[PDB]
Amino acid sequence: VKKIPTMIEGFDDISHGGLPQGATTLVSGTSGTGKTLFAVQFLYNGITIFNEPGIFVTFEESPQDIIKNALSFGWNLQSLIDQGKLFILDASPDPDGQEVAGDFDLSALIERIQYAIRKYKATRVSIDSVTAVFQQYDAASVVRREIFRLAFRLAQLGVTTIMTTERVDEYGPVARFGVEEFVSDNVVILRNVLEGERRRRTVEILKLRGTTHMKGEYPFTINNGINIFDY
């Protein structure tokens, strides 16, 4: 029914309100398209403009590396952690001490995200690199099933989530391993086309649970956040 604003400049105009509230939205793009940036800004703006805390679940980047790189935009992610408004869930693997044998479920991950949501009273969650869990666990069908289960408990707790996914090509399938077909209600596509010397980045609203949105790709730039400017 409703949408929460992202406060990402221009995005709330393409989405006609923001991201569908109480659901997870798929942010899919190739490398260096702005996925992690979009995911961090969605959490940062939720904490800064409103007093809604956010949880950041990372599978690849280190929590300090998330904070250290964030300084490039004037965003003190460390200062939000000290005020209890941000929390980075470190779900990155252990080097040469993580062994998985046989079938598995992501119940401990779903319990960890849930516990963080309830302790910090969060309403926004970002899960960076869903593609990375597929790469870390060689059970494509099992991981795909458990993300579907994760999207439901995220929706059950009422938090609005962003799951980033890596892509194969710029113009190609929607996501790698097919998480589009399970997180199928909300899909945002980020691109990054290299024509000669000019690099044009565009964002597109593919699906928004049938709510109204703007069709097509719209150009955005990166100036201490994401700034979309064609409408």
Partner: protein, 91 residues
């Protein structure tokens, strides 16, 4: 006290019967020292879930005799059997 193991398990259907069975397996493994093997339901100790960065379940963590190890998956006994001779910790 010499060897300490933690078995983190969910509580979906069938986990109840299975978690008791694998626990009996580890406890029947031959050893001359005392070990614990405490079964930790993931719902009751979330602070512990964070310390070991748990994601996949079931997971058995070798805690006391460093280097710490985590063996996960529903076939974790196969790797418990593999590593058990290595866990010959003297002192």
């Amino acid at each position: 006290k010499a060897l300490s193991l933690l078995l983190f398990v969910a509580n979906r259907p069938g986990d109840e019967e299975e978690t008791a069975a694998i626990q009996a397996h580890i406890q029947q493994l031959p050893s001359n020292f005392s070990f614990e093997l405490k079964v930790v339901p993931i719902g009751e100790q979330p602070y512990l879930l964070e310390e070991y960065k748990l994601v996949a379940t079931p997971a058995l963590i070798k805690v006391r005799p460093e280097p710490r190890q985590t063996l996960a998956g529903r076939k974790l006994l196969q790797k418990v059997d593999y590593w058990w001779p290595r866990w010959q910790r003297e002192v």
